[PDB]
Specification:
Chain E: It comes from Tetrahymena thermophila (strain SB210). Chain E: It holds the Pfam family Ribosomal_S8. The structure is cut from a larger assembly and holds chains A (about 160 residues), B (about 80 residues), C (about 200 residues), D (about 150 residues) and E (about 130 residues). Chain A is an all-beta fold. Chain A is built from one helix and five strands, in the order H-E-E-E-E-E. In chain A, strands 3-2-1-4-5 form a five-stranded antiparallel sheet, with no helix packed on it. Chain A is elongated. Chain B contains one helix and six strands, in the order H-E-E-E-E-E-E. Chain B has one helix at about 10-15, and strands at about 30-35, 40-45, 50, 60-65, 70, 75-80. Chain D is mostly helical and about 150 residues long. The chains are: A mainly beta (about 160), B mainly beta (about 80), C alpha/beta (about 200), D mainly alpha (about 150), E alpha+beta (about 130). Chains in contact: A-D, B-C, B-D, B-E, C-D, C-E. The interface between B and D is medium-sized, with 15 and 15 residues. The complex binds magnesium ion (MG) (8 copies) and zinc ion. Chain E binds two RNA strands through helix 1, strand 6 and strand 7.
Chain lengths: ~160, ~80, ~200, ~150, ~130
RNA sequence: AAACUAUACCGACUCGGGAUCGGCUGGAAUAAAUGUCCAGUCGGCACCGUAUGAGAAAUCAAAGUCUUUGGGUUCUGGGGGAAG
RNA sequence: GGACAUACGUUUGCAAACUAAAAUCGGCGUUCGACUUAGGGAGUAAACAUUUUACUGUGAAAAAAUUAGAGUGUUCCAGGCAGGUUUUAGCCCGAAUACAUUAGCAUGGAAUAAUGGAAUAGGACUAAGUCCAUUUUAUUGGUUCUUGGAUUUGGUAAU
């Protein structure tokens, strides 16, 4: 009644079981879409016993992950199940023979399963284009503490 | 010509606290014997305050920059 | 006694004598009772001090468990005196230190406290041996080739107890550590403000 | 030498070589720990407590004897001075300045001096906050100072 | 404040051989300062040397032979591929005969030359000739 | 503003010498002085002598330890006049 | 590079190198010998040593061009041809190589540098108990159990 309607006008799964399950009145009916992107990645416990209907998830959908895999710090928590990760790298300068600092910002999609927080390191995978920016989904989240400015924070992670 | 590893005692005795090799202080500790109670209390060569004799309540030392003047005729051994 | 040991399995002729020897002193002398009650042993090692004189002069070093390290130092002086009289051998007490590995870390959530590192552990013994009195100056020298000599500064007022063990220590260190350790006596360096 | 392009010297204090406790003195770590916490209870700065133990009861360097640094001893025994001497004092005079400034709203050398002192305090906050040794929402403005006055 | 004490110690020393000092006392010292020292020593530039135990960070005393012409460090310790070598050999060294450009490697610290032996080298540290 | 030492701040070194201002520690005479002197020594203006060290030189103990060219960082200049 | 020395690893499988016991076999319980179980180096491959920088090395970096090997285009530019009919309805030989920094991949690593681990406490290792979750057992239950996770406790460690 909550996870289902909640504003939006319906939220099923990829494997349209449900209502039909009432046919198997004895074993386990409460099926949800289960998956495992593999690639050396554990599938979130929370992902399984959730009521969430996120088609853009890498464990609850026919969303693949291929090639490019990222690790970066998180900037913002706003946006619906989407986050911006900031990567901090050095650039070399041919002439002066030294480096300068630089940061690329990245649009990342977050399946409800893992719980966000601002200023923590995150691991993204290469998933098909989900929107103008998005092209990365979160696969493994590590909580971390930064006392204040996320901008000030710059780590060659 | 001088050896820097086996320096004269005098030389190092003159130099400034922090200039000596191993580098040690000048301050020391002393057992003071009140002019009455006799009680023997330990006082630091560079007391930063006035000191009373925990026995009666006499005055033993007055504070200064560095040295501590000892009140009247009180006894003092330099524990070392 | 197998009592005054931690492994409690079997002792060595040396370790055995040391055991009864200790139990002896707490029964004989009332003062070492309190302290020796506490003292436990870890292990004991005997070393031969071979000089060119074809003379066999041995001494033994005893490992006191860390728990009783406090106590061991509390009466250290008197203890060694009686142990040498009662064993006619040179006696040295150390703490049973456990060294941690440099690159062999294995417990992700475990940091190697400096307290148990090779520099600090091996540097420990020296304090332990000269025990009764701690050194004034410590130094390193680099012979051309690449040797490292540790000429250590010992207090003058202790020339007694330390002058004799002096050779044993050198030799035990060269065995455990690997460090050549020559000593040098220097009158203490009292630096106070003599005021007449 | 802090906020000083021109002035700079050497006050003193050089811990003697010998890392052990003085001979003449006998005091199980515990003995001291009592004095320390007792003294502290009365309302003392670990900064001041150590001073006593040196001037009064011949204990040169509590750390050397206990194997414990004063503030630590104190924190283990609940007797921890909430806000560190560091910050505390700076803020104290930082405040004293403000009061004096009021009745002397014209004393310029003091306006300046306060500017430096308030500057420092922002430097400690940056620090003490980063060592999770002070809540992140800490803020010295005028209310943080008067807050401690009550 | 202070920085790259290797530089602190190094010049203090050069100033020594240059002034003709008979020996030198280097105040702030570290493993690096010492390794570099035994590398100069091993190659025969400086004489015997003693490390006094300053209970804080040791003080060293180096004997001065009289063959040190110059021994300094290099500002930021740039990275140096084995391919980047001649550049620096013709750059820093007064000839193709006193090759002593100390570098830091993963293989520790080697002579400008030893790094070609071990075949790796990496970041520059200092030089002496 | 010729807001001038026309000489950025932090740091380490290196020549000699006394005299200073502030603090400290030893000592001597008187005397028993918030004084005087002798000797140290930190820190502060400044001077004297001198460099097989620097410079175009005047000169510089730093304007030194830079072709044997690299401690950290900020600001500035790039023929003159028109022009700040 | 090994080894060993409180000392850069652990498991696996392989190979194994020698030794301590027990068996069998021969001669006269033992002198000895060959042949078995146990044992780690060493010898590979996978799992681990906080995360990068940085450096080694190889995979990738089109051709032409630059460098450059062979090679008398009459020298040369330069083309990539050409060399021997005296085995000539066939012979000999060529079209090589290097550099390619910046970002990505595989990988060896011990220095400098940054980053990190046990401090409210809690951590670590270990045993048991309990609770949650779960693979293979045909499948569904119920127990149990393997396997993860949660706690409580007790033991061990120089906490
Ligand atoms: Mg920074
Ligand atoms: Mg200073
Ligand atoms: Mg005086
Ligand atoms: Mg004077
Ligand atoms: Mg010039
Ligand atoms: Mg002059
Ligand atoms: Mg220049
Ligand atoms: Mg091993
Ligand atoms: Zn009295």
């Amino acid at each position: 009644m909550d996870t289902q309607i909640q504003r939006a006008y319906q939220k099923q799964d990829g494997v349209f079981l449900n209502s039909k399950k009432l046919l198997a009145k004895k074993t386990s009916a409460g099926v949800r879409y289960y998956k495992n992107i593999g690639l050396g990645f554990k599938t979130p416990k929370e992902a399984i016993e959730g009521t969430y209907v996120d088609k853009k998830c890498p464990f609850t959908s026919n969303l693949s992950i291929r090639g490019k895999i990222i690790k970066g710090l998180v900037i913002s928590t706003k946006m619906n199940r989407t986050v911006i990760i900031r990567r901090d790298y050095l650039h070399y300068v041919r002439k002066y023979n030294r480096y300068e600092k630089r940061h690329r910002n990245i649009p990342v999609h977050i399946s409800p399963c893992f719980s966000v927080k601002e200023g923590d390191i995150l691991v993204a995978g290469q998933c098909r284009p989900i929107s103008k920016t998005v092209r990365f989904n979160a696969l493994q989240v590590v909580p971390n503490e930064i006392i204040g400015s996320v901008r000030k924070q710059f780590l060659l992670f | 010509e001088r050896d820097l590893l086996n320096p004269i005692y005098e030389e190092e005795k003159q130099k400034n606290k922090f200039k000596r090799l191993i580098q040690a202080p000048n301050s020391y500790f002393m057992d003071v014997k009140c002019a009455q109670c006799q009680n023997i209390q330990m006082i630091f060569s560079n007391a930063q305050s006035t000191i009373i004799c925990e026995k009666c309540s006499a005055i033993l030392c007055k504070p200064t920059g560095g040295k501590v003047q000892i009140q009247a005729g009180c006894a003092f051994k330099i524990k070392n | 006694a197998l009592a005054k040991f931690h492994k409690k399995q079997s002792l060595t002729k040396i370790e055995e004598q040391v055991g009864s020897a200790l139990v002896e002193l707490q029964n004989t002398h009332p003062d070492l009772k309190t302290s020796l009650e506490s003292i436990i042993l870890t292990q004991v090692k005997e070393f031969q001090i071979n000089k060119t004189n074809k003379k066999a002069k041995s001494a033994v070093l005893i490992y006191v468990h860390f728990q009783s390290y406090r106590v061991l130092l509390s009466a250290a002086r008197k203890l060694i005196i009686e142990l040498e009289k009662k064993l006619k051998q040179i006696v040295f007490f150390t703490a049973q230190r456990k060294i941690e590995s440099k690159w062999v870390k294995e417990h992700k959530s475990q940091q190697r406290p400096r307290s148990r590192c090779l520099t600090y552990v091996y540097d420990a013994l020296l304090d332990d041996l000269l025990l009764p009195s701690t050194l004034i100056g410590k130094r390193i020298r680099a012979r051309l080739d690449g040797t490292s000599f540790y000429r250590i500064q010992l207090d003058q007022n202790d020339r007694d107890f330390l002058e004799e063990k002096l050779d044993a220590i050198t030799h035990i260190y060269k065995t455990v550590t690997t460090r050549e350790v020559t000593f040098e006596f220097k009158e203490d360096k009292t630096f106070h403000t003599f005021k007449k | 030498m802090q906020m000083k392009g021109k002035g700079k010297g050497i006050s003193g204090s050089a811990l003697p070589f010998k890392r052990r406790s003085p001979k003449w003195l006998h005091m199980t770590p515990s003995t001291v720990v009592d004095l320390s916490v007792k003294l502290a209870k009365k309302g003392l700065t670990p900064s001041q407590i150590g001073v006593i133990l040196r001037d009064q009861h011949g204990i040169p360097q509590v750390r050397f004897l206990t194997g414990q640094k004063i503030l630590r001893i104190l924190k283990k025994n609940g007797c921890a001075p909430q806000l560190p001497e560091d910050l505390y004092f700076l803020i104290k005079k930082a405040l004293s300045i403000r009061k004096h400034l009021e009745k002397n709203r014209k004393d310029k050398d003091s306006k300046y001096r306060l500017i430096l002192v308030e500057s420092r305090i922002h430097r400690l906050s940056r620090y003490y906050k980063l060592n999770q040794k002070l809540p992140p929402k800490w803020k010295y403005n005028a209310q943080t100072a008067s807050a401690l006055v009550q | 404040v202070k920085v790259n004490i290797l530089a602190e110690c190094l010049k203090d020393l050069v100033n020594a051989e240059k002034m003709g000092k008979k020996q030198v006392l280097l105040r702030p010292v570290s493993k690096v300062v010492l390794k570099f020292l035994r590398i100069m020593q091993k190659n025969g530039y400086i004489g015997e040397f003693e490390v006094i135990d300053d209970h804080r960070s040791k003080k060293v005393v180096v004997e001065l032979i009289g063959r040190i012409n110059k021994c300094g460090v290099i500002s930021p310790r740039y990275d140096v591929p084995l391919a980047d070598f001649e550049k620096w050999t013709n750059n820093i060294l007064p000839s193709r005969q006193f090759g002593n450009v100390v570098l830091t490697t993963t293989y520790g610290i080697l002579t400008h030359e030893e790094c070609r032996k071990r075949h790796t080298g990496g970041k520059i540290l200092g030089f002496f000739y």
